[PDB]
Each structure stands twice: as C-alpha cells, then as structure tokens.
UniProtKB/Swiss-Prot annotation, chain A:
It is found in: Virion. This is Major capsid protein. Disulfide bonds: none annotated. Capsid protein self-assembles to form an icosahedral capsid, with a T=9 symmetry, about 77 nm in diameter. Each asymmetric capsid nonamer is covered by 9 capsid auxiliary protein, 1 copy of the trimeric head fiber protein and 2 copies of the dimeric head fiber protein.
UniProtKB/Swiss-Prot annotation, chain B:
It is found in: Virion. It comes from Bacteroides phage crAss001. Keywords: Capsid decoration protein, Capsid protein, Virion. Auxiliary capsid protein that forms an outer layer on the major capsid protein protrusions. Interacts (via FD region) with the major capsid protein. This is Auxiliary capsid protein. It comes from the Viruses. GO terms for cellular component: viral capsid, decoration. The keyword Cytoplasm does not apply.
UniProtKB/Swiss-Prot annotation, chain C:
It comes from the Viruses. Forms short fibers at the surface of the viral capsid. One of its GO terms (cellular component) is virion component. It is found in: Virion. Homotrimer. Interacts with the major capsid protein. This is Head fiber trimeric protein. GO terms for biological process: symbiont entry into host cell; virion attachment to host cell. The chain holds residues 1 to 38 of 97 of the full protein. Keywords: Host-virus interaction, Viral attachment to host cell, Virion, Virus entry into host cell.
Length: 51, 333, 38
C-alpha cells in the first residue's frame, strides 16, 4: 500500500515504557490478526493447541 | 428420468425382426403388421412374458415419424484449452501466483445458484518455462480435484505436447513431476466428467464449468494471465444410459407404475435394453378421432429402439419393413 | 507532477507509485512501462 503511510501514532508498533535506564524508553512489536476484505468479508483467528 | 408426454408415450425394443408372428420366439422380436389396404398399423412384440401388440395406428392420422441415430444422443464432453495469453506474457512472470479458479455451476442442486469453486495455485520462478508452468498447474488442479477418493474428479485434466498435439496426457493426484517428462507442453485441457447414472433414480446429468482466471501484475496493471478457449470435444457419453431410463419410464404406461415402492411386495419388470449399448430410435406420433361430437384428438407416441452397429443396419431394416407394410416413406438415417 | 516518495528493493516489480531497485538497475513507471535508467 504505497498510497498510505502507517502512522505509529495509530498503530503504536513502538510505544513508551517506564524504566530506569532512560526516560525515553521504548518497546517495539506488533502482530496482524484480522483482514477485512471487501463486501463484509471478515476473517478472525482462533489458535488451537490441538493444531 | 421423467420425460414429458403428449397424453402418452410408449416404447418397444427391437432386438430382431422376424416378419411373422409365428417367428416370434425370443424376447425383443418384433414384426410390423399392416393390412393390404394400409388402413392400420401395429407392432407385435415378443415380451419376456409372451407376446403383446402395440396400439393400432390410423395411418391417415400420422403426424411425424423420424428415425434418429445414436450419435444425435451422445452428449459431447465440453473441453477447454487453458494457455498463457501472449498479449500479457508468453512466459510465466516470476514472483506472481498464477491462481486458476474452476467455477462449477450446476453443483449438487439443480440451479445455477448452487455454485462450487475449486482452485489451483502456482507461484512462478526464474527460468520457469511455459511447459513447466502448465505441468505444475495441472498437478495442483488434479491434487485438488481428484483428491476426493469417493467417485470421480469433477473434471478430467490433460496436457498436450507440441510433438503430438492430438495425444492427451492424463494428470491425476497420483501423477508425479517425474512422470511428466516432455518439455514442449502448450496447454492445459479441462474436460468434464460423466457423473454416475442409476436406472430410475440417478439420471444422466452433468456439471458445467468455466475456468475463471485471477489477476496478476504485469508491467503496471492487474491482468488475467490466461485464456480459456473451448476446443472441439473428443469424447461422447453414449446413448445406452439414456434409452434405458426411457424404457424404465415408458414401461409404466404398459406395466406397473409401482416399481419398488413396497419393495418385496412388488412386481419384477424385465427391461430389455442393455444400458451399456448404443441404440438408435424411431418415434411415431399419431392420434385418435371419434365418430360424432367426439372430434377431439388423443395424440400418442410409439417409440422403437434398435442397437446401432457402426452402420445403422438394425433400424434401416425395421424402417424398410414398416414402409413396405404401412405405405409410409420414413427416411433411413 | 507524478511525485514518487518511495523506493523498493525486490526482484519483482512493486506498485507503480514507487521506484524499483534490483541489483544494479532502478525503474520507474513511465509510459505504461518500467523504464530503466542508464
């Protein structure tokens, strides 16, 4: 999606953390779970250990 | 199958032509009986339970009599020729997933609302030739279709090498990349399957389909990576399963309408048509009109079937006899 | 006026709103083609 830019304000892949090594202490990480396709097609996930 | 009737229809099998009611010994024997004035015509059939005679045809009241061959009834299996359209690319484009989508329209239900889709996926690579693409694509389709193990794939898949552009090459879920060696493969063929037939309760139906492609990215636009063009069929479901349901239905106008309903408490009806043979047909349409104030008509058909043997020897003799006897001039197919 | 603001390194062409870098060649969508640069 070259058209868009995924703002960290909204995604928050990198967010703030209280610490003692620093005051601007960060933390990264994100995961994609859903995908909303056209016409109401919504795919969630249900991870099962049996799998 | 349940055919439609113009007030009735009836069938009489003709395994042999004997020329005399005294010469009717074995079942299926038939003789066209007509007086010297050609005022009436009827057929004497050797039933397995004896002898029966067809209703009497007022030869002044014959509407149409046409003999149709067996080829005219053999459903042709619609083929296809899937290929990469040189418009977009005459070779696979690496990195693009060449998905193919088979679209089945008359799936278990009768309607076209009852659709069913079977897919096939191939991601291309560098140096991947067209033949190699058709190969992996055929394999993906087979392993997705034939992998039901119950009755039959929804379609049959074949490859064709340019060396022998007529010889097909089957591809099933048991086939292996190693099994397919030739490199001059041009196309993927997708023919439809003869589904199961059951006298009385599973008629000769089919499942029609169209290969819908899915779009890839060439120079800058989404694009359908192939074209599905129909080629002339090369396989025809024979007539045998078609005449047999005709008899099973046309022998409840003479015999019993109950066939197995009260199962043990039912009649055994002996059907004289071999469902594994090819049969020509001969329909005659005629009516009956009354004496006075009873000029309404009762139209009624009499069907006659005879095994085709290369040339239509059995039916052309039957026709010639009916002509010399009734005075008609039915044309010999 | 067609201003690009992304470059993508890959062996398969990216969206047309980006440049295409692949091992010694860059390409941008011009005249319905990926026009190399000399």
């Amino acid at each position: 999606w070259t058209t868009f830019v995924l703002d960290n304000n909204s995604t928050r892949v990198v967010e703030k953390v209280q610490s003692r090594l620093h005051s601007n202490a960060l933390s990264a990480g994100f995961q994609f779970v859903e995908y909303k396709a056209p016409n109401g097609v919504r795919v969630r996930l249900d991870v099962d250990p049996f799998y | 199958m349940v055919i439609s009737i113009n007030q009735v229809r009836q069938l009489y099998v003709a395994k042999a032509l004997k020329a005399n009611t005294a010469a009717l010994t074995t079942a299926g024997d038939i003789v066209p009986k007509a007086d010297t004035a050609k005022t009436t015509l009827y057929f004497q059939s050797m039933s397995p339970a004896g002898i029966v005679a067809s209703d009497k045809i007022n030869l002044k009241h014959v509407l149409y009599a046409k003999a149709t061959p067996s080829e005219a009834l053999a459903h042709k299996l619609v083929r296809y020729s899937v290929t990469l359209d040189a418009d977009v690319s005459a070779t696979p484009v690496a990195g693009q997933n060449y998905i193919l989508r088979l679209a089945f329209r008359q799936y278990i239900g009768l309607s076209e609302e009852d659709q069913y889709f079977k897919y096939g996926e191939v991601i291309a690579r560098s140096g991947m030739t067209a033949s190699d693409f058709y190969k992996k694509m055929a394999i993906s389709l087979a392993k997705n279709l034939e992998n039901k193990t119950e009755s039959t794939p929804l379609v049959n898949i074949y490859l064709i090498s340019a060396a022998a552009a007529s010889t097909d090459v089957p591809v099933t879920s048991a086939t292996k990349e190693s099994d397919l060696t030739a490199t001059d493969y041009n196309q993927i063929i997708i023919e439809e399957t003869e589904q199961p037939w059951v006298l009385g309760m599973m008629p000769q139906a089919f499942i029609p389909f169209t290969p819908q492609f899915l779009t890839i990215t060439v120079d800058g636009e989404d694009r359908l990576w192939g074209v599905a063009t129909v080629v002339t069929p090369t396989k025809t479901v024979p007539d045998g399963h078609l005449i047999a349901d005709l008899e099973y239905f046309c022998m409840g106008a003479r015999g019993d309408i109950y066939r197995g309903m009260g199962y043990p408490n039912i009649i055994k009806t002996t059907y004289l048509v071999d469902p594994g043979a090819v049969y020509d047909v001969l329909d005659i349409h005629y009516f009956y009109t009354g004496s006075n104030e009873s000029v309404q008509k009762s139209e009624k058909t009499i069907t006659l079937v005879a095994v085709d043997d290369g040339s239509h020897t059995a039916m052309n003799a039957l026709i010639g006899a009916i002509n010399t006897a009734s005075g008609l001039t039915i044309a010999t197919l | 006026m067609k201003t690009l603001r992304t470059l993508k390194i890959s062996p398969n062409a990216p969206d047309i709103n980006s440049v295409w870098l692949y091992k010694g060649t860059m390409k941008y969508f011009n005249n319905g083609e990926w026009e190399t640069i000399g």
